[PDB]
Amino acid sequence: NIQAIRGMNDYLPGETAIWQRIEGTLKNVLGSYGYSEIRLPIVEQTPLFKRAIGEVTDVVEKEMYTFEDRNGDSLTLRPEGTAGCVRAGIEHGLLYNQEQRLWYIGPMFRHERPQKGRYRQFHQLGCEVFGLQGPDIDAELIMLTARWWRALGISEHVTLELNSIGSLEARANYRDALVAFLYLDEESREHFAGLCKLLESAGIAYTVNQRLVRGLDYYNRTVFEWVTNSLGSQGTVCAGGRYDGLVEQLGGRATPAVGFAMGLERLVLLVQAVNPEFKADPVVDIYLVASGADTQSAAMALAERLRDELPGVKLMTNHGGGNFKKQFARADKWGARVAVVLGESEVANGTAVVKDLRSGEQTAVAQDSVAAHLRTLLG
């Protein structure tokens, strides 16, 4: 028997439910803003990450899952999404003289030490917006993430650390001031202050971490991250910053850009920790108990009808025999509230017993009306 590549986990039925609830909420919020999904390929040519991310980068150096295609091309399971993004953005000319506010969701691959925060295959929801210079757009991005916390009820457990790393020149003529010892540009100071203001007015509490630089070479002015001193993830749930030059660098015309990516596992962990009781929907609403002389063909028939009469309900047609007791229990296992029982009698009588699994009260109903009775019984 084979196992799962250490650091690359599975999300089982029960865990899945919660992940989908949190995801929807997140997507929904992105919709409330005008943001559109963008779907990018899991692997890209290795030179991309090299060029985009940076050579000296610890990511490039020892975290990438590179390899070779049957044609000698150096391929790489993506470590992030911005690069793949800017790449297709230029590839299909969506960024030239255009505004685009998008988000993507999917896996990323990094070769790191499996931990609580870290995984070898992790999931990111991240969003980028191209075309907007001023701080105003940066502020909207923060506000977006702010809304997210508010919606998950973990607003009380994330802090905004914020910082500006100026431009190339400032970072260029900074080697002296740092390494010798071993200083910002005006337009970047103003742009940062203007953002610091928009937040202040917005009523969003930030903290300027003078020593906050991110792990990628494409960032430029704004740099920020959302951290939980609740150790939901590794500490940082969401992080991101500006990167005006990357579009040009990757071969397209210059346009401004800004974004952030968030660790879904950290998020999901935080939510489940700070909101101890946050269960999402049950897996099965009604479980169709059915037995006797040729029931089944009829039982699935009743079931299909009940699904059209009751859209939105989760109904599971029992299967492969099982005495009443067996099925009732299977019903419970799934967390069915009601059970539409169905013996031969009920079949000949054009009926279907409806048993309320909560109180046990079972009353015979006519098929055409069972839908109505369940609709009330459930809500």
Place this chain on the structure above:
Amino acid sequence: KNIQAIRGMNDYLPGETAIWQRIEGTLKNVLGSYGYSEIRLPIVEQTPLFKRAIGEVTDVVEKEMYTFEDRNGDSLTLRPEGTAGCVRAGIEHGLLYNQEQRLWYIGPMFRHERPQKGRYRQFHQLGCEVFGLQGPDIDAELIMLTARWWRALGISEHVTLELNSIGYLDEESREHFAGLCKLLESAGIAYTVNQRLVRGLDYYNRTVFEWVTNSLGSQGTVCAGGRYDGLVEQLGGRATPAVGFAMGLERLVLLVQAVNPEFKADPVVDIYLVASGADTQSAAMALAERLRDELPGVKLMTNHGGGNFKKQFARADKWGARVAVVLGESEVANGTAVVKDLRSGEQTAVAQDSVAAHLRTLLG
């Protein structure tokens, strides 16, 4: 220089995503109506798994896998399918032993195939598998489910159900096939037994079926699956029966878009927040935030980075904004917000506490 996308590995721009998501949800939703639960699996697996499960003699294992050697010399492979990975995690977490599990999963698969019609290197599959059920009943349920999917997409009148048993069939397999062939007849599902229908994998056993479309929505095939009772044992766990199918989303999306060019999705924006003048923006985002709580479910985009009214008005059009909540200095000092209906052009000055109501009325 510019990097391009790995041939056979394509992106889905904003435009096409809207439609992809509408289609996905319907499918998802339908899976939910039946009791099926999702299971999320890893993109890469240990190569032996695909060898062992899929088959050594399989054209798949031979020249199609995206295998590579991890830093630790371990042979890794980018999944060509999900079943193996599924059964795998199934055994791994002890979900299959003496249990019934009805699940589905959705994500990318990879195969090194020389670039064709409905054949990519990275493609997407929605598939589902249920473990624990012997009888033809369960198989029947699975066909019924796919049938409902076509019905909901409006492509029912464009998929044919090819069916076959692959054990010259032994007693048990014959009775099992017949019993299903009937469940179908009774259910009113029209099938065609293709006596020459064998799948490409080595784990299948009796039922072997596929949904085919003549306009070439899929690579002819949209959906395909069959049984595989022994694979749980083969891969190292106690024997239990199993059945499933996987569907090619690019094919399906292609088909739905062909069989009904009508189908599109909600536009990008509902309300586009026009705004300009002496210090507006800080205030403008303030209103916008408010309107979002008052109007949940509505897609509202706050214009950014200058632009004269005309400019902002056209951008609102680009998005397909129905209304525009304009907001100059006056509106600000007056506690108001001009509500313009981009359809008629009729703009009325409304009080902010009331804008929500007007918009709600204006949209639906």
